[PDB]
mmCIF file of all heavy atoms in Angstrom:
data_model
loop_
_atom_site.group_PDB
_atom_site.id
_atom_site.type_symbol
_atom_site.label_atom_id
_atom_site.label_comp_id
_atom_site.label_asym_id
_atom_site.label_seq_id
_atom_site.Cartn_x
_atom_site.Cartn_y
_atom_site.Cartn_z
ATOM 1 N N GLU A 1 109.026 169.829 127.212
ATOM 2 C CA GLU A 1 108.601 168.395 127.055
ATOM 3 C C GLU A 1 107.136 168.346 127.350
ATOM 4 O O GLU A 1 106.705 168.837 128.372
ATOM 5 C CB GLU A 1 109.419 167.555 127.999
ATOM 6 C CG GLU A 1 110.837 167.983 128.108
ATOM 7 C CD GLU A 1 111.784 166.947 128.626
ATOM 8 O OE1 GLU A 1 111.488 166.291 129.623
ATOM 9 O OE2 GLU A 1 112.917 166.765 128.004
ATOM 10 N N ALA A 2 106.339 167.712 126.497
ATOM 11 C CA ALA A 2 104.874 167.536 126.719
ATOM 12 C C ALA A 2 104.406 166.162 127.145
ATOM 13 O O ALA A 2 103.164 165.950 127.161
ATOM 14 C CB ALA A 2 104.130 168.003 125.431
ATOM 15 N N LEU A 3 105.299 165.250 127.476
ATOM 16 C CA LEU A 3 104.914 163.930 127.883
ATOM 17 C C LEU A 3 105.901 163.310 128.855
ATOM 18 O O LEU A 3 107.116 163.319 128.623
ATOM 19 C CB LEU A 3 104.722 162.973 126.692
ATOM 20 C CG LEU A 3 103.547 163.257 125.774
ATOM 21 C CD1 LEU A 3 103.585 162.266 124.609
ATOM 22 C CD2 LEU A 3 102.215 163.058 126.603
ATOM 23 N N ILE A 4 105.349 162.800 129.973
ATOM 24 C CA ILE A 4 106.215 162.124 131.009
ATOM 25 C C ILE A 4 105.952 160.576 130.927
ATOM 26 O O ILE A 4 104.902 160.168 130.495
ATOM 27 C CB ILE A 4 105.871 162.587 132.407
ATOM 28 C CG1 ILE A 4 104.436 162.287 132.750
ATOM 29 C CG2 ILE A 4 106.181 164.039 132.549
ATOM 30 C CD1 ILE A 4 104.041 162.562 134.167
ATOM 31 N N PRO A 5 106.906 159.800 131.388
ATOM 32 C CA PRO A 5 106.827 158.354 131.403
ATOM 33 C C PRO A 5 105.383 157.751 131.533
ATOM 34 O O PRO A 5 104.837 157.130 130.587
ATOM 35 C CB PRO A 5 107.727 157.916 132.483
ATOM 36 C CG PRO A 5 108.868 158.894 132.407
ATOM 37 C CD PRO A 5 108.095 160.200 132.183
ATOM 38 N N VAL A 6 104.725 157.910 132.667
ATOM 39 C CA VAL A 6 103.401 157.391 132.871
ATOM 40 C C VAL A 6 102.411 157.779 131.764
ATOM 41 O O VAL A 6 101.447 157.049 131.443
ATOM 42 C CB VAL A 6 102.782 157.783 134.284
ATOM 43 C CG1 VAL A 6 103.589 157.145 135.383
ATOM 44 C CG2 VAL A 6 102.719 159.298 134.395
ATOM 45 N N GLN A 7 102.627 158.936 131.178
ATOM 46 C CA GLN A 7 101.737 159.438 130.116
ATOM 47 C C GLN A 7 101.956 158.602 128.858
ATOM 48 O O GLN A 7 101.044 158.265 128.146
ATOM 49 C CB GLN A 7 102.016 160.931 129.803
ATOM 50 C CG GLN A 7 101.366 161.855 130.788
ATOM 51 C CD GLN A 7 101.839 163.284 130.699
ATOM 52 O OE1 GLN A 7 102.155 163.760 129.578
ATOM 53 N NE2 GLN A 7 101.891 164.024 131.779
ATOM 54 N N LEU A 8 103.228 158.304 128.538
ATOM 55 C CA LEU A 8 103.551 157.518 127.396
ATOM 56 C C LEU A 8 102.924 156.128 127.505
ATOM 57 O O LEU A 8 102.296 155.645 126.623
ATOM 58 C CB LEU A 8 105.087 157.379 127.246
ATOM 59 C CG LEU A 8 105.755 158.637 126.695
ATOM 60 C CD1 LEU A 8 107.227 158.411 126.441
ATOM 61 C CD2 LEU A 8 104.996 159.080 125.382
ATOM 62 N N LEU A 9 103.080 155.516 128.718
ATOM 63 C CA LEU A 9 102.527 154.224 128.953
ATOM 64 C C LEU A 9 101.011 154.263 128.785
ATOM 65 O O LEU A 9 100.372 153.273 128.387
ATOM 66 C CB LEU A 9 102.849 153.736 130.334
ATOM 67 C CG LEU A 9 104.366 153.460 130.489
ATOM 68 C CD1 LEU A 9 104.676 153.036 131.951
ATOM 69 C CD2 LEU A 9 104.774 152.340 129.514
ATOM 70 N N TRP A 10 100.381 155.370 129.172
ATOM 71 C CA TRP A 10 98.991 155.519 129.055
ATOM 72 C C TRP A 10 98.519 155.566 127.650
ATOM 73 O O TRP A 10 97.504 154.976 127.265
ATOM 74 C CB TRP A 10 98.436 156.839 129.740
ATOM 75 C CG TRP A 10 96.988 157.036 129.595
ATOM 76 C CD1 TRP A 10 96.384 157.914 128.777
ATOM 77 C CD2 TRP A 10 95.945 156.320 130.234
ATOM 78 N NE1 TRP A 10 95.000 157.786 128.857
ATOM 79 C CE2 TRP A 10 94.695 156.776 129.757
ATOM 80 C CE3 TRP A 10 95.931 155.265 131.218
ATOM 81 C CZ2 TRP A 10 93.462 156.271 130.179
ATOM 82 C CZ3 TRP A 10 94.684 154.727 131.613
ATOM 83 C CH2 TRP A 10 93.484 155.246 131.075
ATOM 84 N N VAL A 11 99.284 156.239 126.779
ATOM 85 C CA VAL A 11 98.913 156.295 125.308
ATOM 86 C C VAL A 11 99.015 154.854 124.829
ATOM 87 O O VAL A 11 98.002 154.424 124.175
ATOM 88 C CB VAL A 11 99.922 157.158 124.505
ATOM 89 C CG1 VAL A 11 99.639 157.012 123.033
ATOM 90 C CG2 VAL A 11 99.815 158.640 124.898
ATOM 91 N N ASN A 12 100.095 154.173 125.101
ATOM 92 C CA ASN A 12 100.287 152.784 124.653
ATOM 93 C C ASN A 12 99.092 151.959 124.990
ATOM 94 O O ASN A 12 98.405 151.384 124.087
ATOM 95 C CB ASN A 12 101.519 152.250 125.369
ATOM 96 C CG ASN A 12 101.986 150.866 124.852
ATOM 97 O OD1 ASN A 12 102.208 150.707 123.685
ATOM 98 N ND2 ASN A 12 102.137 149.939 125.742
ATOM 99 N N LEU A 13 98.740 151.892 126.298
ATOM 100 C CA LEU A 13 97.561 151.083 126.711
ATOM 101 C C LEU A 13 96.332 151.433 125.972
ATOM 102 O O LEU A 13 95.560 150.532 125.619
ATOM 103 C CB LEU A 13 97.371 151.271 128.208
ATOM 104 C CG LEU A 13 95.991 150.761 128.738
ATOM 105 C CD1 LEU A 13 95.946 149.222 128.668
ATOM 106 C CD2 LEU A 13 95.776 151.192 130.169
ATOM 107 N N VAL A 14 96.116 152.683 125.743
ATOM 108 C CA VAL A 14 94.900 153.161 125.158
ATOM 109 C C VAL A 14 94.823 153.080 123.571
ATOM 110 O O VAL A 14 93.703 152.962 123.066
ATOM 111 C CB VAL A 14 94.593 154.620 125.510
ATOM 112 C CG1 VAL A 14 93.205 155.025 125.142
ATOM 113 C CG2 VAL A 14 94.710 154.772 127.024
ATOM 114 N N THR A 15 95.959 153.183 122.891
ATOM 115 C CA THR A 15 95.952 153.169 121.436
ATOM 116 C C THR A 15 96.464 151.901 120.750
ATOM 117 O O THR A 15 96.075 151.545 119.654
ATOM 118 C CB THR A 15 96.693 154.352 120.855
ATOM 119 O OG1 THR A 15 98.095 154.235 121.300
ATOM 120 C CG2 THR A 15 96.097 155.629 121.302
ATOM 121 N N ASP A 16 97.415 151.189 121.411
ATOM 122 C CA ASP A 16 97.963 149.977 120.865
ATOM 123 C C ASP A 16 97.272 148.680 121.354
ATOM 124 O O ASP A 16 97.730 147.555 121.028
ATOM 125 C CB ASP A 16 99.448 149.839 121.233
ATOM 126 C CG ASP A 16 100.287 150.807 120.512
ATOM 127 O OD1 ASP A 16 99.706 151.667 119.797
ATOM 128 O OD2 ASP A 16 101.536 150.687 120.646
ATOM 129 N N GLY A 17 96.147 148.859 122.051
ATOM 130 C CA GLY A 17 95.397 147.734 122.619
ATOM 131 C C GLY A 17 94.175 147.315 121.873
ATOM 132 O O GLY A 17 94.276 146.933 120.687
ATOM 133 N N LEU A 18 93.027 147.360 122.529
ATOM 134 C CA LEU A 18 91.782 146.929 121.914
ATOM 135 C C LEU A 18 91.472 147.570 120.581
ATOM 136 O O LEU A 18 91.026 146.914 119.629
ATOM 137 C CB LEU A 18 90.562 147.232 122.845
ATOM 138 C CG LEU A 18 90.525 146.559 124.212
ATOM 139 C CD1 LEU A 18 90.786 145.089 124.082
ATOM 140 C CD2 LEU A 18 91.510 147.207 125.129
ATOM 141 N N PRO A 19 91.684 148.928 120.384
ATOM 142 C CA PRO A 19 91.393 149.470 119.113
ATOM 143 C C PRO A 19 92.119 148.812 117.964
ATOM 144 O O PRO A 19 91.507 148.440 116.980
ATOM 145 C CB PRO A 19 91.818 150.942 119.243
ATOM 146 C CG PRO A 19 91.476 151.219 120.714
ATOM 147 C CD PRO A 19 92.025 149.948 121.398
ATOM 148 N N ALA A 20 93.387 148.513 118.166
ATOM 149 C CA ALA A 20 94.161 147.860 117.130
ATOM 150 C C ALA A 20 93.640 146.430 116.860
ATOM 151 O O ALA A 20 93.534 145.994 115.679
ATOM 152 C CB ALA A 20 95.638 147.771 117.492
ATOM 153 N N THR A 21 93.314 145.697 117.894
ATOM 154 C CA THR A 21 92.779 144.334 117.845
ATOM 155 C C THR A 21 91.556 144.311 117.033
ATOM 156 O O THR A 21 91.348 143.432 116.217
ATOM 157 C CB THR A 21 92.468 143.804 119.247
ATOM 158 O OG1 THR A 21 93.522 144.121 120.155
ATOM 159 C CG2 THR A 21 92.296 142.302 119.177
ATOM 160 N N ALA A 22 90.704 145.328 117.208
ATOM 161 C CA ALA A 22 89.427 145.474 116.521
ATOM 162 C C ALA A 22 89.579 145.449 115.014
ATOM 163 O O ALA A 22 88.763 144.900 114.307
ATOM 164 C CB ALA A 22 88.743 146.725 117.001
ATOM 165 N N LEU A 23 90.662 146.111 114.499
ATOM 166 C CA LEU A 23 90.858 146.127 113.055
ATOM 167 C C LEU A 23 90.930 144.747 112.490
ATOM 168 O O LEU A 23 90.690 144.427 111.329
ATOM 169 C CB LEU A 23 92.137 146.917 112.743
ATOM 170 C CG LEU A 23 92.088 148.442 112.561
ATOM 171 C CD1 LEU A 23 90.943 149.015 113.261
ATOM 172 C CD2 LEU A 23 93.383 149.056 113.032
ATOM 173 N N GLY A 24 91.365 143.794 113.375
ATOM 174 C CA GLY A 24 91.457 142.367 113.000
ATOM 175 C C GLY A 24 90.065 141.907 112.491
ATOM 176 O O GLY A 24 89.989 140.962 111.666
ATOM 177 N N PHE A 25 89.060 142.539 113.006
ATOM 178 C CA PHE A 25 87.686 142.169 112.622
ATOM 179 C C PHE A 25 87.062 143.010 111.523
ATOM 180 O O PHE A 25 85.840 143.140 111.370
ATOM 181 C CB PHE A 25 86.796 142.218 113.913
ATOM 182 C CG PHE A 25 87.340 141.423 115.037
ATOM 183 C CD1 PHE A 25 87.795 142.035 116.250
ATOM 184 C CD2 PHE A 25 87.498 140.067 114.904
ATOM 185 C CE1 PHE A 25 88.348 141.345 117.246
ATOM 186 C CE2 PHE A 25 88.038 139.322 115.963
ATOM 187 C CZ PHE A 25 88.480 139.967 117.136
ATOM 188 N N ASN A 26 87.945 143.679 110.769
ATOM 189 C CA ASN A 26 87.440 144.484 109.700
ATOM 190 C C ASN A 26 86.732 143.690 108.591
ATOM 191 O O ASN A 26 87.161 142.594 108.223
ATOM 192 C CB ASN A 26 88.578 145.339 109.006
ATOM 193 C CG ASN A 26 88.904 146.590 109.804
ATOM 194 O OD1 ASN A 26 87.992 147.173 110.409
ATOM 195 N ND2 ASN A 26 90.138 146.992 109.716
ATOM 196 N N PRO A 27 85.667 144.211 108.047
ATOM 197 C CA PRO A 27 84.901 143.536 107.010
ATOM 198 C C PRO A 27 85.746 143.474 105.718
ATOM 199 O O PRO A 27 86.789 144.133 105.659
ATOM 200 C CB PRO A 27 83.683 144.482 106.824
ATOM 201 C CG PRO A 27 83.536 145.114 108.180
ATOM 202 C CD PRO A 27 84.945 145.471 108.504
ATOM 203 N N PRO A 28 85.300 142.716 104.739
ATOM 204 C CA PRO A 28 86.043 142.601 103.505
ATOM 205 C C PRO A 28 86.017 143.931 102.744
ATOM 206 O O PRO A 28 84.968 144.582 102.709
ATOM 207 C CB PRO A 28 85.244 141.524 102.727
ATOM 208 C CG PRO A 28 84.647 140.700 103.842
ATOM 209 C CD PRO A 28 84.229 141.767 104.834
ATOM 210 N N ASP A 29 87.134 144.347 102.178
ATOM 211 C CA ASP A 29 87.167 145.580 101.452
ATOM 212 C C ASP A 29 86.126 145.583 100.373
ATOM 213 O O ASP A 29 85.411 144.557 100.169
ATOM 214 C CB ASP A 29 88.521 145.827 100.861
ATOM 215 C CG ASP A 29 89.316 146.980 101.495
ATOM 216 O OD1 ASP A 29 89.110 148.144 101.030
ATOM 217 O OD2 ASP A 29 90.019 146.723 102.478
#
């Protein structure tokens, strides 16, 4: 196994947060 609970939560916080929100501000295609 390459990931423990706290590690999963860390990915979540880091990848499903601000970065995703930012895409909301994407310019017009």
